[PDB]
Amino acid sequence: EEFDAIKIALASPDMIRSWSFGEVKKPETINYRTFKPERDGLFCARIFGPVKDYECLCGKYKRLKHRGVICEKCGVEVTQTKVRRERMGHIELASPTAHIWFLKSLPSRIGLLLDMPLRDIERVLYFESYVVIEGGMTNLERQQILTEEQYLDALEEFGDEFDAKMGAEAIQALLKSMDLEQECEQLREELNETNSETKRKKLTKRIKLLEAFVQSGNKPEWMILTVLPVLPPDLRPLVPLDGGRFATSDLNDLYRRVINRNNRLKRLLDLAAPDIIVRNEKRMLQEAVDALLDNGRRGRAITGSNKRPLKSLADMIKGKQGRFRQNLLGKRVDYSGRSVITVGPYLRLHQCGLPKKMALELFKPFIYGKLELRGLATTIKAAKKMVEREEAVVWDILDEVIREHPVLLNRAPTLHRLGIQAFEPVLIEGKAIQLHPLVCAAYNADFDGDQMAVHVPLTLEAQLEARALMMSTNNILSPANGEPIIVPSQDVVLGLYYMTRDCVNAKGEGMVLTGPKEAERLYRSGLASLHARVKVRITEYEKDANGELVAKTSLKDTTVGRAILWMIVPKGLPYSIVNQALGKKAISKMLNTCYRILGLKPTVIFADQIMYTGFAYAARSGASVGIDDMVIPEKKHEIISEAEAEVAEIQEQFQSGLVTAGERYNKVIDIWAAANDRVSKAMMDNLQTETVINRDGQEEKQVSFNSIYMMADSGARGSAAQIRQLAGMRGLMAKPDGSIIETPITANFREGLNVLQYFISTHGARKGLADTALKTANSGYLTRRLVDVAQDLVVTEDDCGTHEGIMMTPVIEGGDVKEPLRDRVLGRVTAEDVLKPGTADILVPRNTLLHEQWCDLLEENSVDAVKVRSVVSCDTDFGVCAHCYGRDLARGHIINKGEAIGVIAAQSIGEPGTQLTMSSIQVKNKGSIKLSNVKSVVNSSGKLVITSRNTELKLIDEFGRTKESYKVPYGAVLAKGDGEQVAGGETVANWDPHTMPVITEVSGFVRFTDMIDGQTITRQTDELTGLSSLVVLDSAERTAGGKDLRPALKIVDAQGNDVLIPGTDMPAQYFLPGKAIVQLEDGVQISSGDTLARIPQGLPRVADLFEARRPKEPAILAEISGIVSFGKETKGKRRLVITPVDGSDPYEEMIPKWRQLNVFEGERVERGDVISDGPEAPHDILRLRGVHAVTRYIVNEVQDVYRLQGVKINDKHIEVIVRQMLRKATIVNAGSSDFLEGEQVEYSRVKIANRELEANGKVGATYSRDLLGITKASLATESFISAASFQETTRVLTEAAVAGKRDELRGLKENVIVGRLIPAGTGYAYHQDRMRRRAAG
């Protein structure tokens, strides 16, 4: 069985000769009584193989007396009956025909080769016109079409000296004529002549085709076909039912029609007819052929009596009911079952309820072997009927076996890895699996009708895999982010909040105990309040010594509950930690810190006991919701009366006709929103602390004892808006239009809706519901795409010895920190030695793990930037090291190599999203201020104003780490300078949000030069004031006389000389586009910082983001540094006269100046400086920038997207899929291989790592790096089988076939589909054994 690799190829004719047993004949099947095959047809036993034991069709030859005899009555043979499925017959052809995939798909492969278009070839091969096989007289030409009548002209003209024909035969002759060599050298040559772009591309295309056929050895004449295989029956069967009424394939008629039409054809070739019918028949032939190959491709599709079209061969390989997705990747399985699911509250972590008969059914051969071992059921039939008796020993044995035999657990959707688990069995008297409740989380499951299913660890390898990997102890932190996933959900947390609580009210205040035990004596004797602060001693511990506990006791005035709750503490911990009412977040950090500090099991056991005590006390705690908990505040009516009077006033205004309707819309909607807010304040203050309870004092209040509020405060259920829904008016309503309604709701659920109000609720209700139904497909589609890219990657290595990657800095901008740079680093490994602001204090030797000792040790330090051996900066051929990744989250340690990184990345990423679609500047506080890469000016007011748009202001703290960062317009007006100290709450910045200022940093007289009324401009003289200038019109409105003359008001000295840009020799006057209208007159002065002019006025988003979708409106960038001016004057678009400092000027491109410009016609930029506005292209960024810019860009982008919904995932998940979007770099020079072609950046980095190495200095070729859209990148891959499995398979088949492709079974998909072990993780070891075996031969 065992084999190394696979290889595609064309089927040569002699290959079917080499596969064949017999040409076929008449198509009939059986005798309407004797339901038995006829011969040389479709179910002929003779050639595919025999049906029964050693019998001919009549029964003449049998018994092995006639061992090898073929029956001379029927020509029927003697053998076993398995070879049916390995053999294939064949059929010879009366004509030749061509294969369709080499025709009809994009680039033709055949006329492509020939430089003859398709429809030409059609018109030949629909048999409607002839065409020159060969210009015998070169008077006519090879590849020359000659109509049925023009052919005649040439015919009676010449006769002999041409070959000019029609049909597959002519094409055979031609392809058989043409050489590969001469064309190939001549193509390579005359490329040199004019390698114009489309031309050169086409040259390359055909050249490749040529040398491909050369080197594969595949032949073009074998494109044409004269023998065709045949399929065996049982893939196309014919089978009965009770009525003697059968069932058949979609296919058998295809062969039936085909063979019959051949029969007709040959029959009519015996007879020397006109070729008209010959044509008609053979067109029916090719019809039947290519419809077999693809029914519903070419013509009106073919149906039976069904009127459903008939399934092609191709269809069976294709879509989801294609093989790959239907029965090769997902599969029915033996030894499994399913169930409704209920809880086991009392259970332990490892345990799972198990309806015993399920295991009974499932653990059959175990106990049968066990009874032959015991011999009570000596034989097996005895075992069956004894099983059937229900002997108690059956169950004794079954408990005996089921011990330590672990099991699997499956809910659907198994969206991420934790949607299935593996527990130990425990049996139960019922048909209802129990489970440990807390893990509804990972399943997102609930006891409302959900279901689950099971699978069996038969092999011990699976047994142990299970027990070590999917034992629940293993996996309790998410691998995506570092939180526990066993958060105690709703009731437990609440009973907890009840206990650990501090009334003043109940009783028993200000006494002393030795420890919590006698408080239990009280409380279980029922003597003290439990949520009641009272003095007592404790004795806690701490491992302050080198992992050695530090014992001591002392007092606390603590609640009785908290005192008791200490009792479970495992011996490391303070009492301060247990000094509050323990928000759900609190419990999270509890379990966190326990695991962080001790290890797993104390936290485990702690957790179980916590669940248990929660059950106990929340059963004790007393809990109900009712109608008197539901309280509405009183001061609500007259607020609504105020609203009524005010809307009546605004009604009177709109009646009067002063105020408009949309104004009024915003007015009314805002004031209703304010009313809702006031009601919210009312109800919250009237509920949360509504409770006045007195202890040894007149009056005092504390947190409420109402059920509803404590449900809200625990985070178990409820929320302030939800309580508003039941109690208050809940906001307002958007109709399905997307509008928002003017009259919100008045009453609540407590009072009772209106007819209309609920009728109105309906709209947005159904809206959100259809969204509930219909956002998920996006997620699954997305998900399988993502993983389809990224399976191939697994850790290669431990250290790649590589060099620095990207820098790490926090994301605090807009407000405060949004990822602590602490948190950014977490588990990562440096790029380099790294020091402290106390300088020259290195702590990594270029790389260490960075654990919370380091994280806090350097949170002390005010360092705020570090670099890391990046995911992408890694350089291993075929994968990576482990260092460049760092730490396993869900473990909590550096990965040991050999595990799939892509899969968990996508499960991290796409799992959550299912839910997740659903002027001036003002300092807040005091601190230093930083503005860099800045050219600005002390304006005429005495403050800084920008001349370099790149600048943005920051609020730096007094230390130096930024508090805020905010953009600032070009030439905006400040009240402050850089690197100063200024009070919080101050509007430093100001600008008209419509102006785009034209500040003059030169100071000087102004004169009306270059510019004339109505010519380049208008002259508008303000009716308002009296002071104006020459008033510049827009692109269109100026009269075209001076629209080819860039208008420029001009600055000069007294002498009329242009005031140079001070310090530079560049003159300083402004070429004015529209809206830059100046306020001063001729002869007047501007100063430094003086405006001459003022210039007035989602989920699929992320789909576009990672797809590398490239927008419609680029905010384009400076291709190269140096000065620039504008280009040709708008034949559709204007252009851009580049002028480098020292390079070459000519590069210009179209500009829509209908979309605003940023730079002006005498203004300089640096390369990579933005020029237009809108969105931009990342492709340009990579084309211009390196890696870190764009990398950082999109990671920040989409992390902000999901962090809107408050969703936390680490970066490397993102960093890694990027490198799979860069599997290719396009070449620059040549000499190694061909000139440019997009080739593996990996293999590029090899050949340069060999060829530019001492092989040469360089023969080879520089390159540029290439992006690929994920869905195309996937396809654009070495392996084809993966590429055959998900999308656009057919063309992939062809493209592999043409070239003699040969896969090598490295990928996950590749080695799964073959039924081999993984080349990674578990079978990593075995596979690398195979690796160094092949190394070892």
Partner 1 sequence: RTTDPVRMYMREMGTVELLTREGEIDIAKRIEDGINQVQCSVAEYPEAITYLLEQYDRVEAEEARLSDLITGFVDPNAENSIDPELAREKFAELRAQYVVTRDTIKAKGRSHATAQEEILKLSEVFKQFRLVPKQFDYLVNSMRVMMDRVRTQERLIMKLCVEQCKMPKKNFITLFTGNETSDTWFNAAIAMNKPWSEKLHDVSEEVHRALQKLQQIEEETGLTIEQVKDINRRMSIGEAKARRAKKEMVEANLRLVISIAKKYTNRGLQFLDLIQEGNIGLMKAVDKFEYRRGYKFSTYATWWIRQAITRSIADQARTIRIPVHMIETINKLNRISRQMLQEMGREPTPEELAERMLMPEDKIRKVLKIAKEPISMETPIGDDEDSHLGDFIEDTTLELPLDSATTESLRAATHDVLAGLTAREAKVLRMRFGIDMNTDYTLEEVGKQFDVTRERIRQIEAKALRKLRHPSRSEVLRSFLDD
Binding site annotation covers 440? no
**Of these partners, Zn ion, Mg ion, partner 1, none, which one is at the site of residue 58 (CB under 5 to 8 Å by kind)?**
Zn ion
Q: Which is nearer to partner 1, 304 or 984 (CB)?
A: 304
Residue in this structure with the two tokens 């900066």, named with its chain if needed = 873
Length of the chain in residues, anyone?
A: 1337
Q: Which of 70, 269, 277, 857 binds partner 1 (CB under 8 A)?
A: 277
* Choices 266-274, 407-415, 484-492, 698-706 (CB under 8 A): range interacting with partner 1: 266-274
Shortest Å, Cβ 1018 to partner 1: 56
Q: 204 — alpha (psi -120 to 50), left (phi > 0) or beta?
A: alpha
Spatial CB neighbours of 324, under 8 Å, sequence gap ≥ 6: 317, 1284, 1285, 1286, 1313
Q: Residue 380, interface with partner 1 (CB under 8 A)?
A: yes
Q: Measured between alpha carbons, how far is 580 from 590 in angstroms, rounded to an integer?
A: 12
Asked if residues 905 and 1213 have their Cβ atoms less than 8 Å apart, the reply is: yes
Q: Which of 5, 106, 239, 373 binds partner 1 (CB under 8 A)?
A: 239
Shortest Å, Cβ 854 to Zn ion: 20
Q: CB count, 10 Å around CB of 967?
A: 11
Q: Which of 29, 725, 1009, 1294 binds partner 1 (CB under 8 A)?
A: 29
Asked if residues 231 and 238 have their Cβ atoms less than 8 Å apart, the reply is: no
Q: Which of 1, 179, 194, 274 binds partner 1 (CB under 8 A)?
A: 274
Task: Kindly give the interhelix angle for 661-685 and 637-656, rounded to the nearest 10 degrees.
Answer: 170
Q: Measured between alpha carbons, how far is 1218 from 912 in angstroms, rounded to an integer?
A: 20
- What b/e string do you get for 495-504 counting C-beta neighbours within 10 Å, with b at 16 or more? bbbbbbbbbb
Residue 741 DSSP symbol: -
Binding site annotation covers 503? no
Q: Which of 108, 144, 216, 249 binds partner 1 (CB under 8 A)?
A: 249
* Choices 172-180, 377-385, 408-416, 660-668 (CB under 8 A): range interacting with partner 1: 377-385
Binding site annotation covers 74? yes
Shortest Å, Cβ 143 to partner 1: 23
**Of these partners, Zn ion, partner 1, Mg ion, none, which one is at the site of residue 3 (CB under 5 to 8 Å by kind)?**
none
Q: Which is nearer to Zn ion, 56 or 427 (CB)?
A: 56
Q: Residue 378, interface with partner 1 (CB under 8 A)?
A: yes
Q: Which is nearer to Mg ion, 275 or 446 (CB)?
A: 446
Q: What amino acid is encoded at 381 in this protein?
A: K
Q: 1063 — alpha (psi -120 to 50), left (phi > 0) or beta?
A: left
Shortest Å, Cβ 336 to Mg ion: 21
Binding site annotation covers 448? yes
Q: Which is nearer to Zn ion, 213 or 885 (CB)?
A: 885
Q: Measured between alpha carbons, how far is 1314 from 187 in angstroms, rounded to an integer?
A: 42
Shortest Å, Cβ 511 to Mg ion: 49
Binding site annotation covers 315? no
Q: Measured between alpha carbons, how far is 926 from 912 in angstroms, rounded to an integer?
A: 39
Q: Residue 123, interface with partner 1 (CB under 8 A)?
A: no
Binding mask 768-807 for Zn ion (x = CB under 5 A): --------------------------------x-------
Q: Which of 4, 448, 696, 1065 binds Mg ion (CB under 5 A)?
A: 448
Shortest Å, Cβ 557 to Zn ion: 55
H-state helical runs in 272-375? 275-293, 295-298, 313-316, 323, 356-362, 364-374
- How far CA 1029 is from CA of 1017, 1067, 1075, 1172, 1335, in Å, comes to 10, 22, 12, 28, 84
- Total chain residues near partner 1 (CB under 8 A): 46
* Choices 12-20, 304-312, 460-468, 616-624 (CB under 8 A): range interacting with partner 1: 304-312
Binding site annotation covers 163? no
Q: Which is nearer to partner 1, 79 or 321 (CB)?
A: 321
Q: Which is nearer to partner 1, 773 or 1024 (CB)?
A: 773
Q: What amino acid is encoded at 757 in this protein?
A: Q
Q: Which is nearer to partner 1, 381 or 1334 (CB)?
A: 381
Residue with nearest beta carbon to Mg ion: 450
Q: Residue 450, interface with Mg ion (CB under 5 A)?
A: yes
* Choices 59-67, 94-102, 443-451, 697-705 (CB under 5 A): range interacting with Mg ion: 443-451
Q: Residue 311, interface with partner 1 (CB under 8 A)?
A: yes
Binding site annotation covers 71? yes
Asked if residues 229 and 89 have their Cβ atoms less than 8 Å apart, the reply is: yes
Q: Measured between alpha carbons, how far is 577 from 541 in angstroms, rounded to an integer?
A: 13
Q: Residue 246, interface with partner 1 (CB under 8 A)?
A: yes
Residue among 1216, 482, 496 nearest 824 (CA): 482
Cis omega (within 30 of 0) for bond into 810: no
Which residue pairs, CB below 8 angstroms and at least 24 apart, start in 614-620? 614/488, 614/491, 614/492, 614/493, 614/495, 614/496, 615/345, 615/492, 617/495, 617/496, 617/498, 617/499, 618/491, 618/492, 618/494, 618/495, 618/496, 618/498, 619/495, 620/495
Q: Which of 164, 233, 281, 956 binds partner 1 (CB under 8 A)?
A: 281
Half-sphere exposure of 1231 (CA within 13 A, CB side): 13
| Joined tokens for residue 630 | 């539901």
Q: What share of the chain is helix, strand, coil (3-state, %, to 5)?
A: 35, 15, 50
Shortest Å, Cβ 407 to partner 1: 23
Residues 52-91 that bind Zn ion (CB under 5 A): 56-58, 60, 71, 74, 76
Task: Kindly give the interhelix angle for 776-790 and 902-913, rounded to the nearest 10 degrees.
Answer: 170
Q: Which of 197, 242, 446, 628 binds Mg ion (CB under 5 A)?
A: 446
* Choices 2-10, 596-604, 880-888, 1270-1278 (CB under 5 A): range interacting with Zn ion: 880-888
**Of these partners, Mg ion, Zn ion, partner 1, none, which one is at the site of residue 284 (CB under 5 to 8 Å by kind)?**
partner 1
Binding site annotation covers 450? yes
**Of these partners, Mg ion, Zn ion, partner 1, none, which one is at the site of residue 74 (CB under 5 to 8 Å by kind)?**
Zn ion
Radius of gyration of the chain (CA): 41
**Of these partners, partner 1, Mg ion, Zn ion, none, which one is at the site of residue 435 (CB under 5 to 8 Å by kind)?**
none
Shortest Å, Cβ 249 to partner 1: 6
DSSP for 1107-1163, please give it: HT---SS---B-SS-EEEEE-S--BSBB-EEEE-SSS-------B-TTS-BSS-TT-
Binding site annotation covers 184? no
Q: Residue 462, interface with partner 1 (CB under 8 A)?
A: no
Spatial CB neighbours of 951, under 8 Å, sequence gap ≥ 6: 931, 932, 933, 934, 936, 968
Torsion of CA 375, 379, 380, 381, to 10 degrees: -120
Q: Which of 20, 97, 252, 559 binds partner 1 (CB under 8 A)?
A: 252
Q: Residue 777, interface with partner 1 (CB under 8 A)?
A: no
Residues 36-65 that bind partner 1 (CB under 8 A): 64
Cα 1177–1179–1185 angle (5° rounding)? Answer: 105
Q: Measured between alpha carbons, how far is 687 from 632 in angstroms, rounded to an integer?
A: 8
Q: What amino acid is encoded at 455 in this protein?
A: H
Binding site annotation covers 884? yes
**Of these partners, partner 1, Zn ion, Mg ion, none, which one is at the site of residue 446 (CB under 5 to 8 Å by kind)?**
Mg ion
Report residue 394: phi and psi, to 5°. Answer: -50, -50
Q: Residue 831, interface with Zn ion (CB under 5 A)?
A: no
- How far CA 626 is from CA of 492, 508, 962, in Å, comes to 21, 30, 51
Residue positions forming the annotated binding site: 56, 58, 71, 74, 446, 448, 450, 800, 874, 881, 884
Residues within the interface to Mg ion (CB under 5 A): 446, 448, 450
Residues within the interface to partner 1 (CB under 8 A): 28-29, 32, 64, 126, 128, 238-239, 243-250, 252-253, 256, 260, 264, 271-274, 276-277, 280-281, 283-284, 287, 298-300, 304-306, 308, 311, 321, 378-382
Residue positions forming the annotated binding site for Mg(2+): 446, 448, 450
Residues within the interface to Zn ion (CB under 5 A): 56-58, 60, 71, 74, 76, 800, 874, 880-881, 884
Residue positions forming the annotated binding site for Zn(2+): 56, 58, 71, 74, 800, 874, 881, 884
